[PDB]
Design a protein around this nucleic acid. Structure first.
Lengths: 56, 114, 122, 38, 209
RNA sequence: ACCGCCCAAGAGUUCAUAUCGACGGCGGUGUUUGGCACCUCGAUGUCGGCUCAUCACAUCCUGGGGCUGAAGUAGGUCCCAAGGGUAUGGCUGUUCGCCAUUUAAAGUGGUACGCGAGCUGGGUUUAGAACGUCGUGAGACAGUUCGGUCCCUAUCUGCCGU
RNA sequence: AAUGAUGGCCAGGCUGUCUCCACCCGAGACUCAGUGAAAUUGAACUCGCUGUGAAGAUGCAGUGUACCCGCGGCAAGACGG
């Protein structure tokens, strides 16, 4: 129930090769003030689908 | 669902009788005897009902001179030719599993003659 | 639906009220056999002055199992209790002379035609 | 019919036949007389 | 008579005149289409490419649009080759009728089965159970022993192992005939075709003759 | 050791190989009882049950086929043929075994006398206590009966899916 | 006689103990966030099959086969710990 011989350095990278992170890069640009906001998300100013909902 | 809807909208029975879970019931089921056909009685009560249309059920509980041979019919299979009522029952709930072990002197229920 | 040592009631006038499934006939491994199945079983009791005595062994011609009986529309006439009718070794036919209670028309083939002559039911 | 390493003629009518590479025994007199090399 | 496959509508128990019960497969097949030539002439082996069904105007992509534009045809849900049996032989572009099952007396079913994911081995292959008591040590459903010892000491390829099974294509052939309605394009058959209900499963006239 | 076979007394009513065989003869395989001590004693867990298997064929039924002191039937024997199939209970730890009753029929063998990093422990090699016997004892018996602790979060090979 | 968490057997009742398993509800097992271990370790680019050998081969001769790398499972082997 254990490794029997110590693995090499190089392998450790490859096992780590798919775990590379994925960037978003799909920024959405709003129509009211233009503050960058995630597509489908109310803006940091609480805006989405253009209108001022909530209010904070 | 609209496929068989017309398919079997024309295969459910035509003129079924009156029962409850506990109404007396007898499915004249055309069975094989010799070389000719005739009707033979299976009179009983409903202990269990299935409002499912053609694949549904209406239950008959006979007493077979001590040990019955129990039947789960298809109301809408033409193998059930017809039903002729002798009396309905007075039931509360949906499924009269109690109709069986209830026997002899007490086995009866009154008529729900309303 | 009679299996090793099946509780067995008797439909006949022999006196034995006792039978018990020990071997199905007709083919190896034959598991759930009833209705018109013949199997090897042994008698465990009889009436005082009956034609069998404690220990006599025979097979079976079934007429009831707790599983009841299917019919042309998928419908079933279902048995309440596992009560049965034995058979001879050589002449077949239930070893008795008077039989009572439900059998199965599935036993109707002129081989058990003996019983089908005079029954109260089927 | 007889198969062993020992095959021979036994009566007046036979033919021990080399049918390929293993010796044999036949009979043209009696059914018992048939063999091959073993 | 090539086969005709449909969407696994659902199923029924078909009721008759004299106590006959027919729980039948229920399936949808539209007017089929063979869409191309396959044979010696352009490929050297003969086949009839067939799409059936429809697609919403905006989603017919230009090359496939061209594929159908070059075809000049409505979109159908998929193009199938029927390998030409020296009486079988088609060319691009025809919209089909169903008479090709005039008698058949048996057809096929092949398509994605019911969704199951990792089914249990107990179900995939009908293995046995260990006892549930008298000291069972956490083994109420394990597969048990699989292989031998210091001798070959390797696991034979193909060994029936538990895992995902079903929810996939499944040929179902030499299948009795019950009933159809060309006017409705259903297929209602004693015995019910595999797959998820609503599936397409390859229904073809019997290949076991 | 087993099977195989070589000789021909003889038998077999006839007929040494229908089916048997004196005494003697020459092989094959490596499974029973054996020999030898080259490796493992800074650890290669014992009997048997349960789930899952797999091939060889010196062929059990089926298939073929020949012959037969094989009328039909049912046998006896020899050649071909390895696709498929191959019982349920009682008795004792049992394997073994015996027995009850079925079936086409309950083939023989290798695989660490398969399989515990998949299960159990009833048997067999621990501490308690007993009887018979054996010695002055301490205790022994390879004689018998009651009770009694089993670990692994899967690196690599491999295999199933994705 | 009475007594016994005592030894052995045979009746009644009982029921998923079994032929033969089906469904359902809960707590983990799986994805995202944060924190964050152990036994072990000559060195390794770490395939199968016949044969030979301190006499039972991944690493020898001859020979077949096989694009690079993960993720969920399984436990025959690595004389595994």
């Amino acid at each position: 129930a254990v490794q029997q011989n110590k693995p090499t350095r190089s392998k450790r990278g490859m096992r780590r090769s798919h775990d590379a992170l994925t960037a978003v890069t799909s920024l959405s640009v709003d129509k009211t003030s233009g503050e960058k906001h995630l597509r489908h998300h109310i803006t940091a100013d609480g805006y989405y689908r253009g209108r001022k909902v909530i209010a904070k | 669902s609209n496929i068989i809807k017309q398919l079997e909208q024309e295969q459910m029975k035509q003129d079924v009788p009156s029962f409850r879970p506990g109404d007396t019931v007898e499915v004249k089921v055309w069975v094989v005897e010799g070389s000719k056909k005739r009707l033979q009685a299976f009179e009983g009560v409903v202990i269990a009902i299935r409002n499912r249309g053609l694949h549904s059920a209406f239950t008959v509980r006979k007493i077979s001179n001590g040990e019955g041979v129990e039947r789960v019919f298809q109301t809408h299979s033409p193998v059930v030719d017809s039903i002729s009522v002798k009396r309905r029952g007075a039931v509360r709930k949906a499924k009269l599993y109690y109709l069986r072990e209830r026997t002899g002197k007490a086995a009866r229920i009154k008529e729900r003659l309303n | 639906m009679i299996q090793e040592q099946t509780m067995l009631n008797v439909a006949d006038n022999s006196g034995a009220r006792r039978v018990m499934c020990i071997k199905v006939l007709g083919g190896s491994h034959r598991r759930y056999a009833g209705v018109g199945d013949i199997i090897k079983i042994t008698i465990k009791e009889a009436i005082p002055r009956g034609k069998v005595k404690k220990g006599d062994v025979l097979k079976a011609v079934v007429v009831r199992t707790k599983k009841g009986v299917r019919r042309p529309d998928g419908s079933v006439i279902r048995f309440d209790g596992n009560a049965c009718v034995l058979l001879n070794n050589n002449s077949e036919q239930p070893i008795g002379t008077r039989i009572f209670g439900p059998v199965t028309r599935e036993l109707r083939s002129e081989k058990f035609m003996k019983i089908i002559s005079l029954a109260p039911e089927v | 019919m007889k198969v062993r390493a020992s095959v021979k003629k036994l009566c007046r009518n036979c033919k021990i036949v080399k049918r390929d590479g293993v010796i044999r025994v036949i009979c043209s007199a009696e059914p018992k007389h048939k063999q091959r090399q073993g | 008579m090539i086969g005709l496959v449909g969407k696994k509508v659902g199923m029924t128990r078909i009721f008759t005149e004299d106590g006959v019960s027919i729980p039948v497969t229920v399936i949808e097949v539209e007017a089929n289409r063979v869409t191309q030539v396959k044979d010696l002439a352009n490929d050297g082996y003969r086949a009839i490419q067939v799409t059936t069904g429809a697609k919403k105007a905006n989603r017919v992509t230009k090359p496939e649009a061209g594929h159908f534009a070059k075809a000049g045809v409505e979109a159908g849900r998929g193009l199938w080759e029927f390998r030409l049996a020296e009486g079988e032989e088609f060319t691009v572009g025809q919209s089909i009728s169903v008479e090709l099952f005039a008698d058949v007396k048996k057809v096929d079913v092949t398509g994605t089965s019911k969704g199951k994911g990792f089914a249990g081995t107990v179900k995939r292959w009908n293995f046995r159970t260990q006892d549930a008591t008298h000291g069972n040590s956490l083994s109420h459903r394990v597969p048990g022993s699989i292989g031998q010892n210091q001798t070959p000491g390797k696991v034979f390829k193909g060994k029936k192992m538990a895992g995902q099974m079903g929810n996939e294509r499944v040929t179902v052939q030499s299948l009795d005939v019950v009933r159809v309605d060309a006017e409705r394009n259903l297929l209602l058959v004693k015995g019910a075709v595999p797959g998820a209900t609503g599936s397409d499963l390859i229904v073809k006239p019997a290949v076991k003759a």
